[PDB]
Amino acid sequence: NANPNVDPNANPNVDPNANPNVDPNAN
Amino acid sequence: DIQMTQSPSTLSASVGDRVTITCRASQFISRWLAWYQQKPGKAPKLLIYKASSLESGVPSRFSGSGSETHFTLTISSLQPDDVATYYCQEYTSYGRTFGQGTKVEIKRTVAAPSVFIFPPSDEQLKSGTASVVCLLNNFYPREAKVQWKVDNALQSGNSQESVTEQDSKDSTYSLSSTLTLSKADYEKHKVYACEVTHQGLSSPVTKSFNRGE
Amino acid sequence: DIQMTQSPSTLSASVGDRVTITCRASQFISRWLAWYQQKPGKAPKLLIYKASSLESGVPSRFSGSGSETHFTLTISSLQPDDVATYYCQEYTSYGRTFGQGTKVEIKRTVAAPSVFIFPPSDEQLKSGTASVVCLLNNFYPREAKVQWKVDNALQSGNSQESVTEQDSKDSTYSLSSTLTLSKADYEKHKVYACEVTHQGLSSPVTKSFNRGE
Amino acid sequence: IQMTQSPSTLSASVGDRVTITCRASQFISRWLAWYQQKPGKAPKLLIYKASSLESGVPSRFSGSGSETHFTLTISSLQPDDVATYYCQEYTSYGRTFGQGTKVEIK
Amino acid sequence: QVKLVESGGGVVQPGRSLRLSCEASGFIFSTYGMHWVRQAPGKGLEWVAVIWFDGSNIYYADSVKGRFTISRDNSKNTVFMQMDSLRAEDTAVYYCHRNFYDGSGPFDYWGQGTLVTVSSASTKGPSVFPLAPALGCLVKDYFPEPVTVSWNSGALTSGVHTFPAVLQSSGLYSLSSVVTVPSSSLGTQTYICNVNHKPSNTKVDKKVEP
Amino acid sequence: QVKLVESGGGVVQPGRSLRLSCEASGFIFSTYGMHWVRQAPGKGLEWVAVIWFDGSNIYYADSVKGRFTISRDNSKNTVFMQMDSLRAEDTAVYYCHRNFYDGSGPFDYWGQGTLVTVSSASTKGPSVFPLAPSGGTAALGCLVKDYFPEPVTVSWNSGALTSGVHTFPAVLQSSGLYSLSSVVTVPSSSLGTQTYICNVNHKPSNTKVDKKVEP
Amino acid sequence: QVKLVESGGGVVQPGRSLRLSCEASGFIFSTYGMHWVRQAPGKGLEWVAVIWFDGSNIYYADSVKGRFTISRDNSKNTVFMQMDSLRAEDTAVYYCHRNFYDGSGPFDYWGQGTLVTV
């Protein structure tokens, strides 16, 4: 889980946690 | 473990408008809510998801709700396909949590009941147990009281009542009261009476039965 | 620190057209932007987040695009109820940063101003300060000039003017020009006037009056 | 790293379930992307991380797979969506493309 | 199309065990899961258990843990559910629930519903009695639910009232029906109080006369 | 639901302390931070300070650093703001802001705003004068003058007449007192009309004054 | 904004070192790196080379290991490519590529290609 293309960081104002009943590709 | 509570369990509109149901939750459920609808008994049917999104095929039921812990559903005028029972639902993980349920009725006006009484049948007398019925027909609203007199003596604990579901044509309820007793005690008494009281009737009405006639 | 700029300071378009506003930044902020909107005398409202998406309840005639260091917002078919001020925003840390603000107004045909002049009253004369006011109504566009003459002499540095917001019915402006002085100057002279010039009128309009009548 | 794609030809009418295989060389992580190229143009990214869908794309595409086996599936064909499809791996510093899969006609 | 069916259910002596089976015809069980939701007679809905597609994510309700279980056989898309040590207040109607939100819109599918009634009794046919002169019909001392009662084989189905069944303290059910009748409908063609009981084939028709 | 309320605004002389307070009702403050946003009387929005829950990460603006303080009371969901050494340039409207994003969408909430002003002047009541209207439709006006601080509310005929009315924005005179005028267009021959009254209303000092205008 | 523009090239004879430039038209080049990729007619795309900002990994392709020479240029953002000992099967169209993934999505910015024929 370490590549030189992916930027390791996070945005404190948004939390990523998808709902299992919903796919993450919802518009 | 997310407890939910709903608006008062009954409501009436009289083909009015601006009917609101309120659903309250605990903790932080973000915005994941769904509203169902079950007619007396078939199966639930889905109306709104994500707390504001009209389903495909459902008629115009305006419903704007908030986030965090407060949700509301509005009706916007009520035809006659909206007598039912509405449930909340959450979906934030593996599992669900339903609400209690809220009914809707319809009001037209005050009405007067019709009172009738049926004597026991001879075959049922041969069976060893006798049963007498007081029938009250076409009265509104549901609240009513009946009293059984056996030779001018009040009774309790040996009678039961049954009421149907509000009719879709004249919107009135019907009531049946059944009183059961042994044959030996039945032969020891001759005069019987069912007396009813209601807001529609100015005075209580008593119907009497006397054995042997 | 990060500084954000909006290129067009003010806009002007007719109904049913296309308008674009461009937001430029320094450094690198990825795809983090949000466009606000403020109507006069109220609190702002969120319109677009993540520079491409849309919040619920917003009409679908708004759009936005861009990436890295150049963003833009496009509005098509401008209805006459979206006249407001729009701000950028960027949320990439524990802290926000706003823009400067672009204003949007409406265009129409030119108008001919109406001019009135009011002499001072006695109650203010008693106090010791006299004010002379003249008023312009129903003119377009904003740019206009009013000058003050006292006894055929030009004055400067002692007059103030105020303009109202554009109306939502006729889309015309209004202007008030006030001149303040002490009483001694008031009874020293006899003749007063304010002259108005504009694009609409063919020749400058003179309005004047004399003290004591 | 040598990769390969089996279905070098396609034969399906307007509206059909199609599958494409993207067999890999060794056990890489979930680092794979799919490119689509139409004639006389420049390639365009379709899906990354072997699962995501990327913004501004029709929902009729769907990729899946992990470990060493990766696939792609489309619900229909549509005359608009006939082109060539390449596989890419974007781990480490260098890239490595694969072979083409021409959507044949008649 | 897409449909679901449930098997099993019925009547059980308190204690013992059962097995409810859900079969889904119309799709393939490959993503997400399936739930069991029950409804008591004349009360609200409540959740029971969930299963994911492959082998995991088994969660139960609050007062159903310890007992019960869930399982999925391989190959064919079957959902089994084993219950044991059933006391009272667990008699209800069970459904099979499938739900997920995706793409254009939601996808929810419900089942027909299986009836389970726990009782320390046995099957018994009804007893029919008439009412003297509208006119009334009374059925008593039958088990278990439900019973279908009608007049004239549906020829006369206007102005008919059938009150909900009432559970007697003894352990047997009873109810009654009544049909409004014109003032002087003397010499009527026929009046048949047809009754039908599903668990026991006891089709009985009776007559009423003043 | 959720709705924020802030209080503590008003007037202050140039260079003493002042304390604001913003409190909420509807949620429990244990998720993210809270921001203060100030708007100048006629300019664009600006950002001041942010406080995280269980305040650890504290960040101020650039032109406000040093003379401000912000803190959270660790009992209730109330955030404070203590201002020292005010200058004549800090006169604005202060909001209370809270937003965050989640996989379901955005969440944003704003306060209402309490005006804060600094100067060296006392509180006074407005003075009201008429404008005599004295061929075509006429116009008549009502002039208020030397009132402090803002705002004042004017209405004609107790709101009965609300057509053809204009109320120009208030302006600041050199001495430090406000003045404005309000005008109404009137038909040519509305002679002997029912009643024309100047209903004025000042909140900081209760000085409700009604006057009449005649030719 | 980023808009890669490729220039420099034309008709050549067997054996030469004509220059190739990929001067950018927006932003800067202090982040990650930049690649080269070719396509010959009647074939798919293939890898060429990768260069990061300043001295870094310069890993080459499979047919041309340790034979090409590619370098950056401090300031005035550009990447310079130099080949020698040209063969005949090196006629193609060359592109310019820059890819990097972030917590908001991808970034492609595919360049434009130019023709080279022996």
Coordinates of C-alpha atoms in Angstrom, one line a residue, chain D residues 10-104:
Chain D
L10 CA -16.1 -9.7 -31.0
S11 CA -19.3 -10.9 -32.4
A12 CA -22.5 -9.6 -30.8
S13 CA -25.6 -7.7 -32.1
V14 CA -27.0 -4.4 -30.8
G15 CA -27.5 -5.3 -27.1
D16 CA -25.6 -8.2 -25.7
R17 CA -23.5 -9.3 -22.7
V18 CA -19.8 -9.2 -23.5
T19 CA -16.7 -10.1 -21.5
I20 CA -13.1 -9.2 -21.8
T21 CA -10.2 -11.0 -19.9
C22 CA -7.0 -9.2 -18.8
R23 CA -4.8 -12.0 -17.5
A24 CA -1.6 -10.7 -15.8
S25 CA 1.9 -12.0 -15.3
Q26 CA 2.4 -12.1 -11.5
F27 CA 0.7 -11.3 -8.2
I28 CA 0.3 -7.5 -8.3
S29 CA -1.9 -5.5 -6.0
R30 CA -5.2 -3.8 -7.1
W31 CA -3.3 -1.4 -9.4
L32 CA -4.9 -1.7 -12.9
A33 CA -6.6 0.7 -15.3
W34 CA -8.5 0.3 -18.6
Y35 CA -8.1 2.6 -21.6
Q36 CA -10.4 2.9 -24.6
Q37 CA -9.3 4.3 -28.0
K38 CA -11.5 5.1 -31.0
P39 CA -9.9 5.4 -34.4
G40 CA -8.1 8.7 -35.3
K41 CA -8.1 10.1 -31.7
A42 CA -6.3 9.9 -28.4
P43 CA -6.9 7.3 -25.6
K44 CA -9.2 8.0 -22.7
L45 CA -9.2 6.4 -19.2
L46 CA -12.2 4.4 -18.2
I47 CA -11.7 2.6 -14.8
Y48 CA -8.9 2.7 -12.2
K49 CA -8.1 0.7 -9.1
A50 CA -9.9 -2.2 -10.9
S51 CA -13.2 -1.2 -9.3
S52 CA -13.8 2.5 -9.6
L53 CA -15.8 4.1 -12.4
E54 CA -14.4 7.7 -12.7
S55 CA -16.6 10.8 -13.2
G56 CA -18.4 11.7 -16.4
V57 CA -18.8 8.2 -17.7
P58 CA -21.8 6.1 -18.7
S59 CA -22.8 3.4 -16.1
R60 CA -23.0 0.6 -18.7
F61 CA -19.3 -0.4 -18.1
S62 CA -18.2 -2.5 -15.1
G63 CA -14.8 -3.9 -14.2
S64 CA -13.9 -6.4 -11.6
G65 CA -11.2 -8.8 -10.5
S66 CA -8.2 -8.8 -8.2
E67 CA -5.0 -10.9 -7.4
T68 CA -3.9 -11.8 -10.9
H69 CA -7.2 -12.2 -12.7
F70 CA -9.1 -9.1 -14.0
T71 CA -12.1 -8.8 -16.2
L72 CA -14.4 -6.2 -17.9
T73 CA -18.1 -6.5 -18.7
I74 CA -20.6 -4.3 -20.6
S75 CA -24.4 -4.7 -20.4
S76 CA -24.8 -3.9 -24.1
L77 CA -22.7 -3.0 -27.1
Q78 CA -24.2 0.1 -28.8
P79 CA -22.9 1.3 -32.2
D80 CA -21.4 4.4 -30.4
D81 CA -19.2 2.2 -28.1
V82 CA -17.1 0.1 -30.6
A83 CA -13.3 0.8 -30.1
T84 CA -10.1 -0.9 -28.9
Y85 CA -9.4 -1.6 -25.3
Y86 CA -6.0 -1.7 -23.5
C87 CA -4.9 -2.8 -20.1
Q88 CA -2.4 -0.8 -18.0
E89 CA -0.7 -1.3 -14.6
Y90 CA 0.4 1.8 -12.7
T91 CA 2.4 0.3 -9.8
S92 CA 6.0 1.4 -9.4
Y93 CA 7.5 4.1 -11.6
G94 CA 7.1 2.7 -15.1
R95 CA 4.0 1.8 -17.1
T96 CA 3.3 -1.3 -19.2
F97 CA 0.5 -1.6 -21.8
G98 CA -1.0 -4.8 -23.2
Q99 CA -2.5 -5.9 -26.5
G100 CA -5.5 -4.7 -28.4
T101 CA -9.0 -6.2 -28.5
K102 CA -10.7 -5.1 -31.7
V103 CA -14.6 -5.1 -31.6
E104 CA -15.1 -6.9 -35.0

